[PDB]
Design a protein around this ligand. Structure first.
Ligand SMILES: Nc1ncnc2c1ncn2[C@@H]1O[C@H](COP(=O)(O)OP(=O)(O)O)[C@@H](O)[C@H]1O
Ligand SMILES: Nc1ncnc2c1ncn2[C@@H]1O[C@H](COP(=O)(O)OP(=O)(O)O)[C@@H](O)[C@H]1O
Ligand code: BEF
Ligand code: BEF
Ligand SMILES: [Mg+2]
Ligand SMILES: [Mg+2]
Lengths: 50, 330, 100, 417, 210
């Protein structure tokens, strides 16, 4: 439910969840493309402050 | 739309220069560019549009690599074991279908890609066809004698080029005459005219003799050396491995008839059939003939030959810019 | 010969022809300020022998369009606006184009 | 879930399972899409799916894994395989593949392969280090095939006659010359039963081209083997497709050091299919035959050989004669000097109801010395000399009548003296 | 590197050499392109390449040098020869050529000849001064071929029968009239063994069709 909880992980587990096909995966990976951030990162400051 | 695609692939202008599979790949590249211009992001698409009869069914390339830059064409190796990819590069999958291959901008970019592809076709075809005549002399009228080079019509959409450095201030040009030479280099991976013909190379005259001199070509004689200062002096040194022929007596013709003919063909350049010997001493003695030499010395560590000339035949020893010597050193 | 509404308009740059689609009609919602082309009409001012092979060749290669006369209608001088709707009527027998 | 499990099920059990799943009426459509839809459901709610079959490479690069119960036909049952497998494990036309599959996702209709579990009943690692087919060194027949069971029933004697008329071994080419209505069908049936009973280790395959569906049905459930056939209600495309697939499967299997023996009936109908499917090359022979129309049948027949490095391939194709056409004679004449094991069945004996009608005088086997011992082959020579001056009908009369009382063939040889 | 050396090697040795070179799996494809690819590699890193075979002239002017182990078949093993050789040494259909070859450059797939070392086991200089075939003066059989070995084994007697039934000499035309299943195969085999044992100086060739 948070973009910071989705940026710090790869899509290898996205396809593990059923009903995650070509539409959802491409949409998610292209929305972040317009935002510049990359799917799968490494940050320790999480979550500030929630 | 498929009917129009079949009509286009069937009614191509050059069925020989643009083969069928080449039309297929050209249409595929055009549709790829169209699909690229479709989406805002950068995603490469392969087509494979049913080569024989049917319509298109596009795909989506993904470029398996651990990177993420431009994620439209990114799939990490770890997150690729699904779909049974199991590979490291070549994840060209069918995630993308439903392309539009007819609309305005797509039709325009397809026409442009087709123009580029037929140009590339014509180029490759003419080059790898007329390249077979690389050692032998080629004929053909000139297209246009520009500054940096000249372009020559070799026939049916056939083109060659002769560079400016190999030209002469007295060698003389305008669209419409035919100048020959030897195709000396072919760069089929270039961007334009890539059939490079020269005229200053020595073996040219050798090849020339192969059309006129009947003694050459049957190996009974041996044309060894050719010293060519273009416009200055074009001497030839032949050798006879047989025991019933003369090196200079037969190849000269009948009192300057065939040698004079090939000289006028080369541009009236002074041609003197010299006789080289098995040793460099007599070789340079003959190359600077008719004249005397007071000293012939060879030096290996300096890679040089000292030729000191006596007084009495200077008018035949030096000439213009040391031409009578300039060939020997060359 | 009968006049057509093909997008083959010679003696004009591609920028001025960008307002039209492949069928030669301006897209719904493309504003125009000055005198510009909005319907790609051409009429054959010459003779017969206009082969479909010649048609597809002229669209990609070849010389300019021989017999067109550029009978296309342009928006009058000075008047501007934004196109919002287009209507076409076709005599029976004539196949409907893509916009119809 | 295994595909072959639902494959060996009848249609009624598939209907019952589909009705137990509570779906749209599945009994209405093909067994093909019946299995397709029940697999789609059980895979929507079920484990990894498993499947098996034989692979055929398409001109697009990808491949199709098909079933022999459908006689390697195109349909929703097929498994799609990507060219990436054909690069990684370097897959081939005719490989026996068995592995994990999944349902097709959005827009796809073919089950996708996941991981190859067995390639030709063998390791994929060991699937690389293999030997090429024509790169092998062929050899003559070295090991003989024992067709005599030893029980001596009403039909087994038929096989026994073969054991004294034309011995067969692994790697031999058998060609049966018989007119219509000569009893060759149950001849191959008894031969297949005997070679399946005596040798359960070599994989046994039969081929029926343009055959009646009754014989296909009664054969596909009586003998052992992937009984693949081609009925005449399909065009030559399907017949040549079965030819390709099973010949490639046999080639791969002998390449994997296994003895494969292929039963074809008949080679003339298959050659006719080859002729009517191959484009005309301008050269016509007597009876509308192309010169190039026999090239691929000759390849199919000559594929059989006895490998030195390991394994063997023996083909037994039947040929038809005396049926009137031009093609039958031209084909039989073209194939006469090809096979090294002739078996002639004269209708002149079958008209007298003397079965099996075998032309012993006009039959024989070259290089038969490498199949039997010295005294066995000597007894064969002496008996051939004894029976050769006799006619045809009386020859088979004496043979069958003297093999009726004695029950083992060597005992028959002994009592013949 | 000689071509005939890799030719007389079995496929397993080619596979072992290709795996020793550390390349893509070569055992997967034809012996033809197996030899082709291993030659391409060893010539990327190796001496001048050497090869041998028989030449066939194409209607384009160029020629193909092919191997008899492949029964003179078209494939990547062939050596391309230019018409310039067929003008200089005036090459011909059926010449036994052996010479130096190189890998094909950009866009080419056939090995190119460099310099003819032996033309029909002979000098190219002496390849010019030769006599034409039908221009020869034929004659009857002058020298007889000795087929009797003198050991008298189980099969040698067969040849001996020929020596008293129909003597053969160099230049004679032999025609065998036999129905199927008559034992002509090992008849030719024994004849070939005898004429190869008695006369190792004359080059002996056999032909099997269909
Ligand atoms: N071993 C046998 N015992 C009894 N009858 C036989 C035997 N073999 C063949 N027959 C008879 O021959 C006929 C065979 O029919 P069919 O299989 O069509 O012959 P073919 O296969 O030669 O065309 C049957 O009607 C059967 O009565
Ligand atoms: N010299 C020999 N000694 C013993 N047996 C022989 C001899 N020559 C031929 N044979 C017998 O004749 C048969 C020849 O078979 P094959 O080569 O097919 O004959 P053909 O070549 O005439 O068809 C073999 O089965 C072999 O047993
Ligand atoms: F089956 Be019968 F021999 F036509
Ligand atoms: F058919 Be046999 F070899 F004469
Ligand atoms: Mg039958
Ligand atoms: Mg024989």
């Amino acid at each position: 439910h948070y973009i910071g909880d989705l940026v710090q992980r790869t899509e290898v587990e996205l396809l593990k969840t059923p009903n995650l096909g070509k539409k959802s995966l491409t949409e998610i990976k292209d929305v972040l493309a317009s935002r510049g951030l990359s799917l799968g990162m490494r940050l320790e400051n999480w979550p500030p402050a929630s | 739309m498929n009917k129009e695609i079949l009509a286009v692939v069937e009614a191509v202008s050059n069925e020989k220069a643009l083969p069928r599979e080449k039309i297929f790949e050209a249409l595929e590249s055009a549709l790829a560019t169209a699909t690229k211009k479709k989406y805002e992001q950068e995603i490469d698409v392969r087509v494979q549009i049913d080569r024989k009869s049917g319509d298109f069914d596009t795909f989506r390339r993904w470029l398996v690599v651990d990177e993420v830059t431009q994620p439209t064409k990114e799939i990490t190796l770890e997150a690729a074991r699904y779909e049974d990819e199991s590979l490291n590069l070549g994840d060209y999958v069918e995630d993308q279908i439903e392309s539009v291959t007819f609309d305005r901008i797509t039709t325009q970019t397809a026409k442009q890609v087709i123009v580029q592809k037929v140009r590339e076709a014509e180029r490759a075809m003419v080059v790898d066809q007329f390249r077979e005549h690389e050692g032998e002399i080629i004929t053909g009228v000139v297209k246009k004698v520009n500054r940096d080079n000249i372009s020559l019509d070799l026939g049916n959409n056939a083109e060659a080029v002769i560079l400016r450095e190999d030209m002469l201030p007295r060698e003389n040009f305008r669209p419409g005459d035919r100048v020959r030479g030897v195709l000396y280099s072919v760069r089929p991976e270039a961007r334009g005219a890539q059939l490079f013909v020269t005229r200053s190379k020595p073996e040219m005259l050798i090849e020339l003799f192969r059309i006129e001199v009947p003694e050459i070509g049957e190996e009974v004689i041996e044309i060894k050396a050719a010293a060519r200062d273009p416009g200055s002096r074009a001497k030839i040194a032949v050798k006879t491995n047989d025991k019933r022929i003369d090196p200079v007596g037969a190849c000269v013709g009948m009192r300057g008839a065939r040698v004079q003919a090939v000289s006028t063909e080369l541009g009236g350049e002074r041609i003197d059939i010299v006789l080289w010997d098995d040793n460099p001493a007599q070789f340079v003695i003959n190359a600077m003939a008719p004249a005397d030499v007071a000293s012939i010395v060879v030096d290996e560590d300096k890679h040089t030959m000292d030729i000191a000339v006596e007084a009495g035949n200077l008018a035949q020893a030096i000439g213009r810019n040391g031409q009578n010597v300039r060939l020997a050193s060359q | 010969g009968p006049e057509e509404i093909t997008a083959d308009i010679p003696n004009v740059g591609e920028a001025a022809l960008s307002k039209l689609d492949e069928s030669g009609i301006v897209y719904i919602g493309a504003e125009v300020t000055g005198g510009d082309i909005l319907v790609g009409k051409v009429t054959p001012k010459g003779e017969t022998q206009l082969t479909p092979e010649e048609k597809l060749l002229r669209a990609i290669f070849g010389e300019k369009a021989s017999d067109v006369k550029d009978s296309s209608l342009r928006v009058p001088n000075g008047v501007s606006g934004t196109v919002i709707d287009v209507q076409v009527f076709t005599r029976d027998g004539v196949e409907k184009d893509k916009r119809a | 879930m295994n595909l072959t499990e639902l494959k060996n099920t009848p249609v009624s059990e598939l209907i019952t399972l589909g009705e137990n799943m509570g779906l749209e009426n599945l009994a209405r459509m093909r067994k093909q899409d019946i299995i397709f839809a029940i697999l789609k459901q059980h895979a929507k709610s079920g484990e990894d799916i498993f499947g098996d079959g034989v692979l055929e490479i398409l001109q697009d690069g990808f491949g199709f894994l098909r079933s022999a119960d459908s006689s390697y036909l195109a349909g929703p049952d097929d498994i799609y395989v990507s060219p990436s497998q054909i690069r990684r494990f370097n897959l081939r036309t005719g490989d026996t593949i068995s592995g994990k599959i999944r349902p097709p996702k959005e827009g796809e209709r073919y089950f996708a392969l996941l991981k190859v579990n067995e390639v030709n009943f063998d390791k994929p690692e060991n699937a690389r280090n293999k030997i090429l087919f024509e790169n092998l060194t062929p050899l003559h027949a070295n090991s003989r095939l024992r067709m005599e069971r030893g029980n001596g029933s009403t039909e087994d004697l038929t096989a026994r006659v073969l054991d004294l008329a034309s011995p067969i071994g692994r790697g031999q080419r058998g060609l049966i010359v018989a007119p219509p209505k000569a009893g060759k069908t149950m001849l191959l049936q008894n031969i297949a039963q005997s070679i399946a009973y005596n040798h359960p280790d070599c994989v046994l395959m039969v081929l029926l081209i343009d055959e009646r569906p009754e014989e296909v049905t009664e054969m596909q459930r009586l003998v052992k083997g992937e009984v693949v056939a081609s009925t005449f209600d399909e065009p030559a495309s399907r017949h040549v497709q079965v030819a390709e697939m099973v010949i490639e499967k046999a080639k791969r299997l002998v390449e994997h050091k296994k003895d494969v023996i292929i039963l074809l009936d008949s080679i003339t109908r298959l050659a006719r299919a080859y002729n009517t499917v191959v484009p005309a090359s301008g050269k016509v022979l007597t009876g509308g035959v192309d010169a190039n129309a026999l090239h691929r049948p000759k390849r199919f027949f000559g594929a059989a050989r006895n490998v030195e490095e390991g394994g063997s391939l023996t083909i037994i194709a039947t040929a038809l004669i005396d049926t009137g056409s031009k093609m039958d004679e031209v084909i039989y004449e073209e194939f006469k000097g090809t096979g090294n094991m002739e078996l002639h069945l004269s209708r002149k004996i079958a008209e007298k109801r003397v079965f099996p009608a075998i032309d012993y005088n006009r039959s024989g086997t070259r290089k038969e010395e490498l199949l039997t011992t010295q005294e066995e082959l000597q007894k064969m020579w002496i008996l051939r000399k004894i029976i050769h001056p006799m006619g045809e009908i009386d020859a088979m009369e004496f043979l069958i009548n003297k093999l009726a009382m004695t029950k083992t063939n060597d005992d028959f040889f002994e009592m013949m003296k």
